[PDB]
Design a protein around this motif. Structure first.
Motif, short mmCIF file in Angstrom:
data_model
loop_
_atom_site.label_atom_id
_atom_site.label_comp_id
_atom_site.label_asym_id
_atom_site.label_seq_id
_atom_site.Cartn_x
_atom_site.Cartn_y
_atom_site.Cartn_z
N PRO B 181 30.56 -1.12 -23.98
CA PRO B 181 30.80 -2.55 -23.81
C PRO B 181 29.51 -3.36 -23.92
N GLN B 276 29.01 1.47 -18.74
CA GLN B 276 30.19 0.69 -19.10
C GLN B 276 30.04 -0.78 -18.75
N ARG B 277 29.15 -1.09 -17.81
CA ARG B 277 29.01 -2.45 -17.32
C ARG B 277 27.63 -3.03 -17.63
N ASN B 280 27.16 -5.19 -20.75
CA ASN B 280 28.35 -5.94 -21.12
C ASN B 280 28.17 -7.44 -20.90
N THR B 317 31.74 -14.09 -25.97
CA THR B 317 32.29 -13.02 -25.17
C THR B 317 31.88 -11.69 -25.79
N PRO B 318 31.68 -10.66 -24.96
CA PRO B 318 31.15 -9.39 -25.47
C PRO B 318 32.20 -8.67 -26.31
C1 LIG Z 1 33.04 -6.76 -19.96
O1 LIG Z 1 32.92 -8.08 -19.50
C2 LIG Z 1 34.01 -8.90 -19.85
C3 LIG Z 1 33.71 -10.31 -19.36
O2 LIG Z 1 32.70 -10.86 -20.18
C4 LIG Z 1 35.30 -8.38 -19.24
O3 LIG Z 1 36.37 -9.13 -19.78
C5 LIG Z 1 37.13 -9.74 -18.73
O4 LIG Z 1 37.87 -8.77 -18.02
C6 LIG Z 1 38.63 -9.30 -16.95
C7 LIG Z 1 39.37 -8.14 -16.30
O5 LIG Z 1 40.22 -7.56 -17.27
C8 LIG Z 1 39.64 -10.32 -17.45
O6 LIG Z 1 40.29 -10.93 -16.36
C9 LIG Z 1 38.96 -11.39 -18.29
O7 LIG Z 1 39.95 -12.18 -18.91
C10 LIG Z 1 38.11 -10.72 -19.36
N1 LIG Z 1 37.45 -11.71 -20.18
C11 LIG Z 1 37.49 -11.62 -21.51
C12 LIG Z 1 36.80 -12.71 -22.28
O8 LIG Z 1 38.04 -10.69 -22.09
C13 LIG Z 1 35.50 -6.89 -19.54
O9 LIG Z 1 36.56 -6.38 -18.76
C14 LIG Z 1 34.22 -6.12 -19.23
N2 LIG Z 1 34.31 -4.70 -19.54
C15 LIG Z 1 34.03 -3.76 -18.64
C16 LIG Z 1 34.11 -2.33 -19.11
O10 LIG Z 1 33.73 -4.01 -17.46
#
Ligand SMILES: *[C@@H]1O[C@H](CO)[C@@H](O[C@@H]2O[C@H](CO)[C@@H](O)[C@H](O)[C@H]2NC(C)=O)[C@H](O)[C@H]1NC(C)=O
Ligand code: HEM
Ligand code: HEM
Ligand SMILES: *[C@@H]1O[C@H](CO)[C@@H](O[C@@H]2O[C@H](CO)[C@@H](O[C@@H]3O[C@H](CO)[C@@H](O)[C@H](O)[C@@H]3O)[C@H](O)[C@H]2NC(C)=O)[C@H](O)[C@H]1NC(C)=O
Ligand SMILES: *[C@@H]1O[C@H](CO)[C@@H](O)[C@H](O)[C@H]1NC(C)=O
Ligand SMILES: *[C@@H]1O[C@H](CO)[C@@H](O)[C@H](O)[C@H]1NC(C)=O
Ligand SMILES: *[C@@H]1O[C@H](CO)[C@@H](O)[C@H](O)[C@H]1NC(C)=O
Ligand SMILES: *[C@H]1O[C@H](CO)[C@@H](O)[C@H](O)[C@H]1NC(C)=O
Ligand SMILES: [K+]
Ligand SMILES: [K+]
Lengths: 446, 446
Positions: B181, B276-277, B280, B317-318
């Motif tokens: 990510p 994973q984070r 991201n 967004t990533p």
């Molecule tokens: C990486 O970060 C992004 C945010 O920048 C996460 O995307 C969000 O995830 C949450 C939980 O599913 C959602 O409520 C949001 O709508 C998401 N935002 C977008 C723009 O998609 C993503 O889950 C993260 N990945 C990890 C592995 O933690």
């Protein structure tokens, strides 16, 4: 009552570590140097007591010793009573029939004010300690040269680079050591300045110190090996075994450490590994003639040259006590890489390897220097033999670069000589004084 | 697609060992050198395939790369299609506003013909392997210089000398790496010469190689630490805590590896460790103005200077995929001893430590050279910011030895400048080409 708390570890027990570094320095700022010598070094110098307990053994064991010029730089003008120490090893080189021309250039003078011995089980730890020492002292010292050393790998551990088990034989200090069978037994004062029966008057602060003879002795291992093969005494069986035999007769021990005086025709590894047995000989045998028999051990073998035992008188049965005063304590460690495939296949050395030679003694003229010049280099030592010419020590004997004439090596004719190229090459070294620990934060930092 | 059996392991995956040596050589006798290159070196060069399997790790991992002059010494006159490589890094020093006066003398020229990278879990193993190499090649090779490097001890393992977790962020090669990510995704041709979407014509034998930009970068750790303490923004937090914040705002990560973009006021070690984070992010945040907001991460922070992400447009967004062509694969490793008590007490470096910096790229002009000059050293990059003057990369930004002007670092006032001495000092380096393995016993030996 040897005050072992005050005697630096390497002198009497060795450093008991896998790796060592020899760090040769100059002093640039005496006043600054003294502060750190007393505050930072003194407290971490490892003693005999400390090193003699696996519990009090530090991560990095530290000893330190000064050259004559090092002592002068610290304003220490006392006479330590040793004129060879005072004049330095460079001026002494002609005694051993070598020229300083082959020396490490920094040995070829008196610029080296001292040496720090670091010992540890990893080189990593040693390097961190060097860093720590250099930043502590800062500009008050300069490194002029250093040499890394280690116990050889695996099965070869405690063997030197020609492959022979080492450290078997030391003098036993009366009242300190438990004598092993065959071991010479000597007054403390032979090794420790101001100790029992040291006839030389010392400055009181120097009592409990020792003189360190350091030597960087390169060994030509592939060339050695090939020479053994080429000149293996006729007989049987295998060529390698007869090469090994000849090797043995040169040193006076098999590579296992089995003394050839006790087992003259074949190795005995268990004997070699047995401290209770492997030193238990005098060179006398009922009923052979000591003056003429070389069938057990040649008169010219390294160890017999360096400790002649019954060759110089005394008990014919163990233990012989002759020539006590000419004992040295040895803390030598191999240096350099193992022989490579390429070097072995070509029978040619390309990488410098050898022995970082360290001998301790209270009188340099009685120890290392005497052994080298008056015994090892002396074609007519030991005296009273037939034939009279023994030849030089095949390991360490020197003759101004000339191949060495060595007699007695061939079991079936002791008149048969060999002309033997040098397999050990001196790159020189220096004479230091290893002060008692109290002098380090005491007189020397005053 | 990507033939990973033919790609030298360090380019794509690193050496996966505790210790490395960078062995810089010259070729004295090309005919002989070639012989041994083919018979001795080629067979043991570690591929990406071998290094990717826990159970096929070599005891000593070996990679090899050549300079322009090294290729010439081998009678290889082909155009590798890289003008920076052709010129060597000494001639590039002006581009980075650094004087060659601070360079390792051996780097300041084109006498170095290549570099052998050795990796092992001990330095003993490396030492023995060096000896093996030098005995095999004999006088046909010469050691000009070497740098020993190591993973840092204990809990600092994987951290660079300033104490920050390293190696978190790399380009994901499309088809090779499964992207994490936030990770940038790039064509293989960005890293591997002649791989997918490499626009530059290469000699056929060079397909599957990479350009290795080596830099010996000294780090002034005590000085860095002191600067943080002295310049930490006033606040209710402890002094150490405000110093750490400043440090993290210089790097763009906390020492734990936590990206400040995601945790701007606090370390989060759980985050730092989670692949994973921990990557991201894009630098974008609702609803903050990307062009002026430095509360999450200063525009001048190292990682933000070196991977601008959303600063160069693309997805808010990533994952952000901007500037893919300016990606480098990083195989850097720390060198030198740990900070000593003397240096720490004094706030002053005396022992050289830092980063043995290795970047891999198919175009030097798009990778390291580009990141150093166009981005890091540029007070107006990234573009479109308010205020316009971002200042320099506090970590690696260079201004001809002058203090660097760096803005944005203080959360309370994004216009507030600091004048920052260099914490990193370039001792130079060289540009090499790491060939495909097939080339090593193929064209380069022919
Ligand atoms: C990486 O970060 C992004 C945010 O920048 C996460 O995307 C969000 O995830 C949450 C939980 O599913 C959602 O409520 C949001 O709508 C998401 N935002 C977008 C723009 O998609 C993503 O889950 C993260 N990945 C990890 C592995 O933690
Ligand atoms: C690189 C050169 C040298 C090699 C390879 C070498 C090798 C050996 C070996 C294999 C032993 C037998 C093992 C043991 O008894 O512990 C030994 C013992 C000895 N060596 Fe050396 N040696 C070298 C240099 C020296 C030098 C320069 C001296 C002093 C001048 C010296 C003095 C001794 C002494 C005194 C003994 C013990 C003798 C005994 O107690 O019976 N050696 N050496
Ligand atoms: C000794 C000097 C240097 C230090 C202390 C240093 C420190 C760091 C640190 C702590 C990170 C974060 C770890 C990570 O994300 O993987 C990092 C990332 C990085 N550094 Fe360096 N660095 C140095 C030199 C360089 C140089 C010279 C360049 C290129 C010119 C460079 C390019 C990068 C890149 C590209 C990243 C990854 C950023 C990302 O993908 O978001 N670094 N550096
Ligand atoms: C060190 O070597 C000496 C030999 O030079 C060993 O001394 C000898 O030790 C043996 C014991 O196995 C003694 O043998 C005994 O002899 C008596 C008569 O003297 C006999 O009645 C017994 O049946 C037995 O065979 C031998 O006398 C003795 N010789 C001398 C001169 O002391 C000594 O044991 C060796 N030390 C070690 C630890 O191996
Ligand atoms: C080295 O010497 C040994 C015995 O003399 C021999 O077996 C071997 O072939 C020699 N090697 C070379 C390259 O001469
Ligand atoms: C012993 O070797 C010498 C050579 O120095 C020779 O004169 C003599 O003939 C040899 N002895 C025997 C019994 O062969
Ligand atoms: C090192 O820097 C710290 C923080 O500025 C300071 O407290 C300390 O006194 C300095 N040490 C010396 C020896 O100047
Ligand atoms: C901070 O920003 C700049 C720094 O030079 C300055 O002009 C401005 O007055 C400062 N603002 C505050 C609130 O300190
Ligand atoms: K003397
Ligand atoms: K380029």
């Amino acid at each position: 009552s040897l005050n072992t708390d005050d005697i630096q570890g390497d002198i009497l027990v060795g450093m008991h570590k896998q790796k060592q570094l020899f760090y040769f320095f100059a002093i640039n700022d005496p006043a600054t140097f003294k502060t750190h010598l007393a505050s930072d070094i003194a407290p971490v110098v490892a003693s005999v007591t400390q090193l003699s307990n696996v519990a009090t053994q530090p991560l990095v064991a530290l000893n330190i010793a000064f050259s004559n010029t090092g002592l002068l730089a610290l304003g220490v003008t006392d006479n330590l009573g040793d004129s060879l120490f005072a004049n330095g090893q460079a001026k002494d080189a002609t005694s051993f029939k070598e020229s300083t021309s082959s020396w490490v250039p920094q040995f070829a003078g008196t610029g080296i004010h001292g040496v720090i011995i670091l010992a540890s089980d990893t080189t990593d730890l040693i390097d961190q300690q060097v860093a720590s020492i250099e930043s502590t002292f800062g500009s008050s010292i300069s490194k002029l040269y250093s040499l890394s050393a280690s116990i050889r790998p695996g099965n070869e551990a405690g063997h030197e680079m020609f492959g022979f088990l080492d450290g078997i034989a030391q003098p036993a200090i009366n009242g300190f050591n438990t004598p092993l069978p065959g071991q010479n037994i000597v007054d403390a004062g032979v090794i420790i300045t101001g100790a029992t029966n040291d006839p030389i008057t010392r400055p009181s602060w120097a009592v409990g110190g020792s003189f360190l003879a350091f030597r960087q002795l390169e060994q030509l291992v592939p060339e050695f090996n090939k020479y053994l093969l080429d000149n293996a005494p006729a007989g049987s069986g295998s060529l390698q075994a007869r090469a090994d035999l000849l090797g043995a007769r040169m040193v006076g021990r098999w590579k296992s450490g089995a003394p050839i005086d006790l087992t003259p025709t074949a190795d005995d590894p268990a004997l070699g590994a047995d401290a209770q047995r492997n030193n238990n000989f005098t060179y006398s045998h009922a009923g052979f003639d000591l003056g003429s028999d070389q069938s057990h051990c040649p008169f010219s073998a390294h160890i017999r040259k360096t400790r002649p035992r019954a060759d110089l008188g005394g008990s014919l049965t163990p233990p012989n006590l002759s020539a006590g005063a000419n004992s040295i304590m040895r803390s030598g460690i191999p240096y350099g890489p193992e022989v490579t495939s390429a070097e072995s296949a070509s029978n040619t050395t390309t990488q410098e390897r050898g022995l970082a030679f360290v001998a301790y003694q209270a009188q340099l003229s009685q120890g290392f220097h005497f052994l080298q010049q008056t015994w090892a280099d002396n074609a007519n030592f030991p005296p009273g033999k037939t034939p009279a010419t023994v030849g030089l020590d095949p390991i360490i004997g020197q003759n101004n670069g000339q191949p060495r004439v060595v007699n007695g090596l061939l079991p079936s004719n002791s008149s048969a000589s060999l002309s033997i190229p040098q397999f050990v090459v001196s790159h020189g070294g220096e004479y230091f004084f290893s002060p008692p620990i109290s002098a380090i934060g005491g007189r020397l930092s005053a």
